[PDB]
Design a protein around this ligand. Sequence first.
Ligand SMILES: CC[C@H]1CN2CCc3cc(OC)c(OC)cc3[C@@H]2C[C@@H]1C[C@H]1NCCc2cc(OC)c(OC)cc21
Ligand SMILES: [Mg+2]
Ligand SMILES: [Mg+2]
Ligand SMILES: [Mg+2]
Ligand SMILES: [Mg+2]
Ligand SMILES: [Mg+2]
Ligand SMILES: [Zn+2]
Lengths: 139, 217, 96
Amino acid sequence: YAPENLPAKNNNSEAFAVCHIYAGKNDTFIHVTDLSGRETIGRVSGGMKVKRHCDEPSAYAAMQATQDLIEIITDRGITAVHIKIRADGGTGKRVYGQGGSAAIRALVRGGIKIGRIEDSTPIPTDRTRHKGGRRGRRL
Amino acid sequence: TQRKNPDPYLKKEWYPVIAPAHFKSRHIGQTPVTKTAVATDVINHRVYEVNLGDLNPLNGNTKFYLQTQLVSDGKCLTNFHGMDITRHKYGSLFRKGCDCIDVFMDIPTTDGYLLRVFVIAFTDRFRFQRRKNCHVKGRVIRMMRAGIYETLHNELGKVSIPVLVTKLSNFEVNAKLTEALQKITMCRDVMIRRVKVVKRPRNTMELLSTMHDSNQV
Amino acid sequence: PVKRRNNGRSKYNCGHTNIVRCQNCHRCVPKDKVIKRFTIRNIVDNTIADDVLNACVIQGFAIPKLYNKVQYCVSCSIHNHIVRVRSREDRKIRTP
RNA sequence: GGGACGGGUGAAACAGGAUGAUCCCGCCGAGACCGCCGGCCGCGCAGGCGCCUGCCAAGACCGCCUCUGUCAAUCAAGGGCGAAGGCCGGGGGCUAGAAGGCGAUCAGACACCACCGUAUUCCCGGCCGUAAACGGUGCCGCCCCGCGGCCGGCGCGCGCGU
Ligand SMILES: CC[C@H]1CN2CCc3cc(OC)c(OC)cc3[C@@H]2C[C@@H]1C[C@H]1NCCc2cc(OC)c(OC)cc21
Ligand SMILES: [Mg+2]
Ligand SMILES: [Mg+2]
Ligand SMILES: [Mg+2]
Ligand SMILES: [Mg+2]
Ligand SMILES: [Mg+2]
Ligand SMILES: [Zn+2]
């Protein structure tokens, strides 16, 4: 890449981005965007690093995807990120999967500085009816 | 079916983003865009979330929203667009045995902006109260709602966007709210939940020029 | 015969109460009969908190928490050991 | 914007993807709903009742050396209200979802699990008049060991605390 194709270097601050984590029960997404969400620098998922469908939310695949993302973004000149940890939400579980902690650790030990952290799970003040009926999943 | 494509990031360049003068730190960061084939217009409108503490190195649970209105000298200028609190603080605010009050009102401005502001209050426990629950009767509740409305009207009935942003950066509105309410009963947490912009004028140049490079202004 | 004086619920001075949904099976349950627990926990678990703080840049940054309310039905609470089946004499104890 | 899977499960497989899907951001539209506070709190004849603002009538209780003077209790016949589902005639059409279809599992599975989905669920006017409509205990009235909690109103005492 040419110098223009990378963030400008200035000692006053460091190149800060934003990382979005989707810690679902079936898959995990690690996504990097600028301060706004209108662009994208690196997008990886745990379904690329495994062959078994049930292992897509497994933490090991999360770590592999995360370190690949680290390689790409460090190539593109990004060192510090903010964290937006999210679950499925929307009349759902509202609890994280098991890939989130793996992603956090993998970022931390990939030489990626950490900024602020917040929860971005979509939650309502109301509720449309969820599936399952009034007797639930009877199995 | 799959095809390879050239790396997008060989035709990209970054631009800086600047904030108004109310804050000590004004460099928000940098934004990439794709080469004109026009960068200026595409990056004309973008909203950046900023934590208040980073703007003013109390301040760690509030964040602002800032939208670009003009690109000049290859750097983007922004003004106020919204204020909100973090989710963990809101979750912490709630405790059983208490009463909750949430009020929202519409407030115009001299510049033509119209804003909706959300206010949240909770009750607390008297120092030597026998009971453990801290609920209150109805007349008290209506008194508190009336006081909230009256104080908000008085301290924000007439205002300008720069003044509003300075007030939000400080906490004088919250201080006035609590002192007005505390004379009624024991309130616990009183503050502004968030601020929204309902409608604004199409053209905002003199306001950006005022907000930016205000320095002494 | 009657097993419990409360009929298995907390319903006093009313006829009907609003309903909720179990979080694991999505069954519909009355609000006064569902089992509720409030939890507070860290977003990052306790083993990596020190690493998170060292990698953080802000000074005095406090770890944000999670505030959630979990609601379970009778069948799912038992299956997940939320409550235990107790003895005849011990059914009258009401402490946590 | 970006470039290869995504969804779903105990595990899978049907439906989605180079017509660029999933993912991030912003905007637009319509219709439902009223959360954490929320409770051995409360209101209502019962069935039942939770967004902001305003309007209309109503009600039990408490306090009173205010008025009347037995005007009361309970009840065949008769009258009114009455969850959900259902029906008639008009509206509207996002979620879920009888019927129906499809993929798994099974000896079989037209069932449990996955996915698509009609009536219905929402509003107005009108029928139906049933529920584990349960405190499985009819209404009015008198006496009755002791301890404790909560709700509303009133009064007393003091060192003035809800
Ligand atoms: C005889 C039908 C049951 C057997 N099958 C196929 C094999 C299988 C394997 C599983 O992992 C070991 C499994 O997860 C528990 C389920 C099955 C199914 C399940 C069939 C029975 C089904 N209904 C009754 C009991 C039961 C209990 C279950 O545990 C929660 C379950 O998993 C969702 C399914 C079932
Ligand atoms: Mg079972
Ligand atoms: Mg029995
Ligand atoms: Mg009932
Ligand atoms: Mg009906
Ligand atoms: Mg009976
Ligand atoms: Zn459940």
